[PDB]
From a paper:
To learn more about how circular permutation affects folding pathways, we analyzed a protein domain with a relatively complex folding pathway, namely the second Postsynaptic density protein-95/Discs large/Zonula Occludens-1 (PDZ) domain from synapse associated protein 97 (SAP97). SAP97 is a member of the membrane-associated guanylate kinase family, and involved in establishing cell polarity and synaptic potentiation. PDZ domains are usually part of such multi domain proteins and have important roles in molecular recognition. PDZ domains consist of six β-strands and two α- helices ordered in the following way: β1- β2- β3- α1- β4- β5- α2- β6.
A circularly permuted (cp) SAP97 PDZ2 domain was generated by fusing the N- and C termini of a pseudo wild-type (pwt) SAP97 PDZ2 with a glycine and serine linker (GSG) between E315 and P405. The new N- and C- termini, K327 and P326, respectively, were selected since they correspond to the terminals of the naturally occurring circular permutant of a PDZ domain from a green alga. The structure was solved by molecular replacement and refined to a resolution of 2.3 Å. The cpSAP97 PDZ2 protein structure has the typical PDZ domain fold with six β-strands (β1 to β6) and two α-helices (α1 and α2). The weak electron density and high B-factors for the Gly-Ser-Gly linker and the neighbouring residues in both molecules suggest that this loop is highly flexible. Interestingly, even after moving β1 from the N-terminus to the C-terminus, the orientations of the side-chains in the Ile317-Ile323 region of the cpSAP97 PDZ2 structure are similar to those in the pwtSAP97 PDZ2 structure. The data show that the circular permutation has decreased the stability of the protein from 4.7±0.03 to 2.4±0.09 kcal/mol. To sum up, our results show how a circular permutation neither alters the structure nor significantly affects the function of the protein, SAP97 PDZ2. We further demonstrate that the canonical protein and the circular permutant fold via a similar mechanism, and that the rate of formation of the low energy intermediate has decreased in the circular permutant.
Numbering used by the authors:
A (entry chain B): 13 to 104
B (entry chain A): 12 to 105
Write the structure that this text describes.
């Protein structure tokens, strides 16, 4: 990053007991994610580009974030919403 | 994200055959843009999508290039056999 944010969670690395989801835990100031403004700390990462982030390890979630091009398509759910999915496009 | 009517495989870190990083067409949907145009074939090696070279890239990158396409798409493609090596194939999204 790159995109200026950090994540926690993953299978075998649960951020809440019993939940395998990836979560944003840190958003760098004046970084790509921040400058856009849509992404918030606590948001669940559903998918990066065409790679689903449900039931993957933390390492796979990082790999998925590296192997975008400069063009990034994030799918995200806000904590306690819907389920409603939201798309966030970002440039590295 | 897909209206060109085909799927790919291969890529750095996701080789279709050992040692081979190339992107290959592995599926073509009957009735789709690729099918109705008729030039693209299962087995074909995909070299570019518009401005994006696909020589030594991850599968995620190759997919992403095909994701960020508009109405008219330019594909560069390597055909085996006795013809010209590179074929360009332009397609309209359905």
């Amino acid at each position: 990053k790159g995109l200026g944010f950090s994540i926690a969670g993953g299978v075998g690395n649960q951020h809440w007991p019993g939940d395998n989801s990836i979560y944003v835990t840190k958003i760098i100031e004046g970084g790509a994610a921040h400058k856009d403004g849509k992404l918030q700390i606590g948001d669940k990462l559903l998918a990066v580009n065409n790679v689903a982030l449900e039931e993957v390890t933390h390492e796979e979630a990082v790999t998925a974030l590296k192997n975008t091009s400069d063009f990034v398509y994030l799918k995200v759910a806000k904590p306690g919403s819907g389920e409603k999915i939201m798309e966030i496009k970002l440039i590295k």
